[PDB]
Amino acid sequence: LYPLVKKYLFSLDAEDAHEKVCKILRTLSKSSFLCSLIHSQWGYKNPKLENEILGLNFPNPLGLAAGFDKNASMLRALIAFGFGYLEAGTLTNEAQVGNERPRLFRHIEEESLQNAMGFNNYGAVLGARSFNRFAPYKTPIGINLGKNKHIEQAHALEDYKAVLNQCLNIGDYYTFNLNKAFVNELFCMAKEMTHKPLFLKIAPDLEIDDMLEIVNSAIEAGAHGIIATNTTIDKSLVFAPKEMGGLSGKCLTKKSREVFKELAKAFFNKSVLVSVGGISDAKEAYERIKMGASLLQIYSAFIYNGPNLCQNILKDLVKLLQKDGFLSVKEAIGA
Ligand SMILES: Cc1cc2nc3c(=O)[nH]c(=O)nc-3n(C[C@H](O)[C@H](O)[C@H](O)COP(=O)(O)O)c2cc1C
Numbered sequence: 001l002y003p004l005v006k007k008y009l010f011s012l013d014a015e016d017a018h019e020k021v022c023k024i025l026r027t028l029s030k031s032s033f034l035c036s037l038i039h040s041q042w043g044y045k046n047p048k049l050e051n052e053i054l055g056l057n058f059p060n061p062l063g064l065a066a067g068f069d070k071n072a073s074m075l076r077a078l079i080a081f082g083f084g085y086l087e088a089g090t091l092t093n094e095a096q097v098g099n100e101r102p103r104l105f106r107h108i109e110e111e112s113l114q115n116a117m118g119f120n121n122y123g124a125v126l127g128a129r130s131f132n133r134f135a136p137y138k139t140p141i142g143i144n145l146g147k148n149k150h151i152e153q154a155h156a157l158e159d160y161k162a163v164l165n166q167c168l169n170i171g172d173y174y175t176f177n178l179n180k181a182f183v184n185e186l187f188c189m190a191k192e193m194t195h196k197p198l199f200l201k202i203a204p205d206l207e208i209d210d211m212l213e214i215v216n217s218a219i220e221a222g223a224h225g226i227i228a229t230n231t232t233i234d235k236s237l238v239f240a241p242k243e244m245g246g247l248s249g250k251c252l253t254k255k256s257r258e259v260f261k262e263l264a265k266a267f268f269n270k271s272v273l274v275s276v277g278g279i280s281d282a283k284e285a286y287e288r289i290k291m292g293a294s295l296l297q298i299y300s301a302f303i304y305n306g307p308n309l310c311q312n313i314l315k316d317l318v319k320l321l322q323k324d325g326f327l328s329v330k331e332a333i334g335a
Pocket residue numbers: 065066067068070089090104113114115117119144177201229230231248249250252276277278279297298299300301
């Protein structure tokens with residue numbers, strides 16, 4: 001039972017626990033049989049959840065958010081737990097340690113996390129090797145690209161070019177983890193290097209007008225989709241000072257929802273919208289889809305719910321579609 005695994009893991013430092021889980025996931029990824037075994041217990045397939053988006057086949061709309069598999073080394077095991085797709089990364093051009101530890105904290109009663117990890121990854125060269133070790137994969141795989149911490153904001157566009165150039169032969173889409181005057185050149189540069197879908201991922205703490213400016217520049221430069229949101233630093237909760245990083249999980253549900261309503265209001269008919277932040281159950285996921293989200297992502301609820309996360313949410317989602325009159329998730333994406 002996962003409750004016993006959680007009691008053990010939650011008694012450990014949160015990053016230590018994550019590394020013990022990554023070690024097991026990397027080991028399981030070596031065995032396609034054990035992955036097919038995992039999928040038979042925790043997978044869930046339903047044609048009502050299938051969609052084709054930007055040339056790509058998503059068998060369900062529920063993806064694993066970036067930051068869980070930063071180095072593209074356990075994708076096969078994670079797919080076996082039922083996600084419709086995975087986003088690996090954030091990957092940087094060169095390896096990078098990230099911020100000083102401790103940098104991950106749990107707020108267990110609130111089913112939330114707080115992190116200031118800062119792009120710890122082994123670099124794109126190794127990340128492409130690790131992707132290739134077990135490729136091809138049974139779902140789409142996104143590659144989340146970032147800028148190395150030291151790369152000066154002058155030759156910073158040239159850093160997104162180097163990491164994207166190193167990842168050109170892996171993955172099915174790219175996410176850029178993000179000034180309105182720079183987003184146009186980023187996606188213009190990127191459009192000339194690959195034909196694969198391009199997404200902008202935004203924080204949830206932008207002023208709405210400032211948010212509409214940034215996003216609109218991205219679309220007009222050729223961005224194909226917007227991912228909202230990353231973690232928040234607005235909720236000044238007493239038990240989570242700001243020096244411990246951004247909040248994820250259920251403490252993010254409300255602001256992520258609010259940000260996404262505004263995003264959809266301005267951009268639903270002009271871009272693919274992906275909702276992230278504090279999705280833990282099928283009702284919330286179904287609300288995001290009805291608000292305008294073609295796809296979803298989860299990080300924190302995977303910690304708190306465990307391997308049954310996907311089939312729980314997806315089974316319930318099917319019943320919501322059927323208790324609403326939709327023959328598939330494609331009809332539900334409407335206002
Ligand atoms: C420990 C941790 C590491 C993360 N690392 C990244 C990352 O490397 N790149 C990224 O774009 N988002 C990263 N995220 C953000 C998640 O992808 C997601 O945007 C956020 O956690 C909100 O979703 P959630 O409420 O389902 O957790 C990270 C989140 C956590 C908790």
